[PDB]
Design a protein around this ligand. Sequence first.
Ligand SMILES: CC(=O)N[C@H]1[C@H](OC[C@H]2O[C@H](OP(=O)(O)O)[C@H](NC(C)=O)[C@@H](O)[C@@H]2O)O[C@H](CO[C@]2(C(=O)O)C[C@@H](O[C@]3(C(=O)O)C[C@@H](O)[C@@H](O)[C@@H]([C@H](O)CO)O3)[C@@H](O)[C@@H]([C@H](O)CO)O2)[C@@H](OP(=O)(O)O)[C@@H]1O
Ligand SMILES: C[C@H](C[C@@H]1O[C@H]([C@@H](O)CO)[C@@H](O)[C@H](O)[C@@H]1O)OP(=O)(O)OC[C@H]1O[C@@H](n2cnc3c(N)ncnc32)[C@H](O)[C@@H]1O
Length: 322
Amino acid sequence: MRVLIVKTSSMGDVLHTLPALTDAQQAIPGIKFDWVVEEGFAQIPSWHAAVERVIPVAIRRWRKAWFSAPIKAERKAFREALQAKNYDAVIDAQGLVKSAALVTRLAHGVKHGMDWQTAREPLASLFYNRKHHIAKQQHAVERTRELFAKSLGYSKPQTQGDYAIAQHFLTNLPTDAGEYAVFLHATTRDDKHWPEEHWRELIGLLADSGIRIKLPWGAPHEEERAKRLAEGFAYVEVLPKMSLEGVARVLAGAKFVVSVDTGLSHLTAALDRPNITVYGPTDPGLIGGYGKNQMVCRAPGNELSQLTANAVKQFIEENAEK
Ligand SMILES: CC(=O)N[C@H]1[C@H](OC[C@H]2O[C@H](OP(=O)(O)O)[C@H](NC(C)=O)[C@@H](O)[C@@H]2O)O[C@H](CO[C@]2(C(=O)O)C[C@@H](O[C@]3(C(=O)O)C[C@@H](O)[C@@H](O)[C@@H]([C@H](O)CO)O3)[C@@H](O)[C@@H]([C@H](O)CO)O2)[C@@H](OP(=O)(O)O)[C@@H]1O
Ligand SMILES: C[C@H](C[C@@H]1O[C@H]([C@@H](O)CO)[C@@H](O)[C@H](O)[C@@H]1O)OP(=O)(O)OC[C@H]1O[C@@H](n2cnc3c(N)ncnc32)[C@H](O)[C@@H]1O
């Protein structure tokens, strides 16, 4: 049995799909998945043992010059790579018109996705052969597991979802695995950042432990913030630019992580690393992290400026006390 997954974006949503593959592999021996994913996240699906051919799309990049000749050629090539196999099922776990119309509609095989009432964009449901009702108010992980279970004809297991990607990293753990924490400071929107002074106070409060701290970055403004945080603290290292796989290796070796609500926090969750996520204006309810040792630190009044470094250190201490 060969299944095509359509689940293109964003980073966390791609990661959240992994436990559904693991469920399906256990219920259907020898099932294999191809996966249409945005090019920036193409590495993620390759880490799961049930995945064969990743089929990158670049919808977001194509939209700037959609009819430009090189773009028309990439689109053409994408359709050809999409239509190369006949799939036993095509599962659209995204539920957007972009995903349904630009990708799912063109693939060969029976097309499964969410119905009018449960899809993110209801009109996406017009493009499916098999519509499934997947209740909106559950964690993203559980929704996708339910969609896979209903699409492929097996009962949704009651056990906790298993991403099954940490084994891929078992063979490549950094040498200094266990001797550092990773601080994930970069996110999407000003009010979701923990103010810089609070990070630096936290870092300061860990002078006395002798722990090492590593700071990733994936764009210029993030590099500069990483440098301001590390300034004056010899136990803090600013990582060089790396691939998504590289930063995953780093996270896989971390004793623990402290993070804002961000893509790489969900990657941390997918790798089962202890993670303290700091939330203000976003609700850890449904798009909180799902996994082992994902801890939730709620800023007073939902405002991150009000959450002190002391309160976070104490939260770490209270949680280790297990
Ligand atoms: C037409 C349009 O704008 N489509 C874009 C869309 O969103 C749907 C919806 O957005 C608004 O409605 P809301 O009121 O905000 O619900 C618009 N209305 C108004 C009044 O502004 C409507 O026109 C639209 O129908 O957003 C996409 C970005 O979404 C993703 C992504 O798939 O890439 C997914 C986001 O994830 C969630 C979510 O919060 O909605 C939750 C997950 O658990 C999943 O359930 C997932 C779902 O399967 C859909 O994929 O959605 C989130 O992760 C975001 C990122 O934060 C954004 O960076 O990414 C748009 O895709 P693009 O970013 O343009 O590629 C889509 O074009
Ligand atoms: C990973 C992705 C890369 C971009 O992908 C685009 C598309 O395929 C997906 O939209 C392409 O159009 C584009 O060519 C480019 O490859 O960025 P992101 O979703 O914004 O990453 C979200 C956040 O996660 C961080 N991040 C993402 N990759 C990171 C890395 N290798 N090291 C450190 N941080 C990293 C970023 O800095 C952000 O804060």
